[PDB]
């Protein structure tokens, strides 16, 4: 597919490895620190200031302060699932809405079938087939982060021409308890 010929010409491979020190206690990052499951209960970790104590998010370790980037993500059948970026200085501890204007760019899945955009207000998507692999793209340049289906390339959403300034972080969010994983492909 042009998708598979070109991504890798267009955009630097990130080989993304999670970040345990930035999961929420219900999360756990597995040994090869490419996927990312929920525990029942919050597991005993400390309040470290690089954690999210309310949202249940994990950071990947590198950041982005330029260039065009490109990560995949199998999402297989899970049910619920948000994932992008989001800025260096987001706030960690408490709540604050994932939305663009507080410094996450993400969409995903909830509720088996409703595709959205997490916005302010959240807008839902229309998607063809259901994906099972999602490319994230990032250029900083043009400000435009991407998210295509990495099977069949198809696009899924673009936000536009945004004025990034800080650092940007792959982020994963996932709110369920269920058997599949969010997992990285690695690069």
Known sequence: SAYNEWKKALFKPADVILDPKTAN???LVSEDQRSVQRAKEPQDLPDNPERFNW?????????????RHYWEVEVGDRKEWHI?????????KGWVKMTPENGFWTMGLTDGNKYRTLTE????????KPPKKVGVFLDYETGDISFYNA????????????SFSEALYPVFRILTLEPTALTICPA
Not at 55 to 67: A, Q, R
Not at 85 to 90: D, E, Q
């Open 84 to 92: 992008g970026v989001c800025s260096k200085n987001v706030q960690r």
């Open 55 to 67: 949202h249940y998010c994990v950071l990947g370790c590198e950041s982005f302060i330029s260039g």
């Open 121 to 128: 207000p959240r807008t839902n998507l229309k998607l063809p």
């Open 25 to 27: 206690p219900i999360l």
């Open 151 to 162: 099977v069949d390339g198809s696009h899924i959403h673009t936000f536009l021409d945004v």
